[PDB]
């Protein structure tokens, strides 16, 4: 532990929390539109999305259908990923603030005690 350190990590992880939060909102919007266009179209980091298709990887009509399904899925996934990732960040912020306050209190006490000992030995 180190106040300098914890402070730094908290600044980072707080940023991440907001950025990730915003990416959840963008994904959510995109997915909403897509979902609407889902059915109609069926008549003619993004989580494990890219991962899945790639791991398993070892005109018009098809192209259009595939892409439509894929976008919906993608933005869904990403929305979920970000939601979880911002959540993870929040919990980790809280856990670090606790650790910052414990260390902060111990440091103060420790320097206090050294000062008193050195005064009392006179």
């Amino acid at each position: 532990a180190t106040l300098k350190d914890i402070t730094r990590r908290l600044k980072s992880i707080k940023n991440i929390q907001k950025i990730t939060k915003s990416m959840k909102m963008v994904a959510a919007a995109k997915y909403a539109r897509a979902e609407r266009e889902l059915k109609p179209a069926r008549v003619y980091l993004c989580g494990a999305i890219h991962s899945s298709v790639a791991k398993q990887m070892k005109l018009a009509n098809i192209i259009y259908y595939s892409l439509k399904e894929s976008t919906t899925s993608e933005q869904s996934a990403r929305m979920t990923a970000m939601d979880n990732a911002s959540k993870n960040a929040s919990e980790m912020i809280d856990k670090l603030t606790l650790t910052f306050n414990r260390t902060r209190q111990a440091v103060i006490t420790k320097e206090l005690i050294e000062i008193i000992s050195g005064a009392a030995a006179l």
Partner: protein, 255 residues
């Protein structure tokens, strides 16, 4: 002497951190019991009895005053350390400076979110109040979205405008050293930004704009600068004349 004789004085204590070290030294050598950071128990009482002497006398006592601007140097951002904690509680508010803003280009490196004045508007002219209230609300909105900036690759027009105002205003807050401006010149340049005229100008240019625009109004539009004071605020006329000036000027600026 000024405070008690109908005059007004300003006193800057640079720094109170060092006055406290000096006092601590004497206290420890006199063998008084040490405490947090080895400071004596009455270290708060040192500063309190000092700062309280700062005061606004009533008309029956001459109406003079003593304003005080104590300085405190913190260690690696520690506002909760002992002397800072004390002087922050004794005063009416703080102007917080940060290294990180300094090197980013923000100078004076004032932190607008953390600085405060419990007195606030009570000591601010109407013209400044007007424009400052809009700027304080806009900047506050900006702070909330400011992180999404470099990663929001699809931000909606609403949040995208908050950002633009935010960068524009931050740029109008930047100010060169040893060049304190009059209040009428401050409302005029703020006016520019809070009215959205600079929403199109590229951020990197806003600093060159302000300097040119200000030098121009100082020269050709003295009468508009005086009116801004007189009327106390931005009159309906001043508000139209400023619109003509900045539009034309801007247009020339980007010719």
């Amino acid at each position: 002497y000024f405070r008690d004789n109908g005059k007004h004085a300003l006193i800057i204590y640079d720094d109170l951190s060092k006055q406290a070290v000096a006092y601590r030294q004497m206290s420890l050598l006199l063998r008084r019991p040490p405490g947090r950071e080895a400071y004596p128990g009455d270290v708060f009482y040192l500063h309190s009895r000092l700062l309280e002497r700062a005061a606004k006398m009533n008309d029956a006592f001459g109406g003079g005053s003593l304003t005080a601007l104590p300085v405190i140097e913190t260690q690696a951002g520690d506002v909760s350390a002992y002397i800072p904690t004390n002087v922050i509680s004794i005063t009416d508010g703080q102007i917080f400076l940060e290294t990180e803003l300094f090197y980013k280009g923000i100078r004076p490196a004032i932190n607008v979110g953390l600085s405060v004045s419990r007195v606030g508007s009570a000591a601010q002219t109407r013209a400044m109040k007007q424009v400052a209230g809009t700027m304080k609300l806009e900047l506050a909105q900006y702070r909330e979205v400011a992180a999404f900036a470099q990663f929001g690759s699809d931000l909606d027009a609403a949040t995208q405008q908050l950002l633009s105002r935010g960068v524009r205003l931050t740029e109008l807050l930047k100010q060169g050293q040893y060049s304190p401006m009059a209040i009428e010149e401050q409302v005029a340049v703020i006016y520019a930004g809070v009215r959205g005229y600079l929403d199109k100008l590229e951020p990197s240019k806003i600093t060159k704009f302000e300097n040119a625009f200000l030098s121009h109004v100082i020269s050709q539009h003295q009468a508009l600068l005086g009116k801004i004071r007189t009327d106390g605020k931005i009159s309906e006329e001043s508000d139209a004349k400023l619109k003509e000036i900045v539009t034309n000027f801007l247009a020339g600026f980007e010719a």
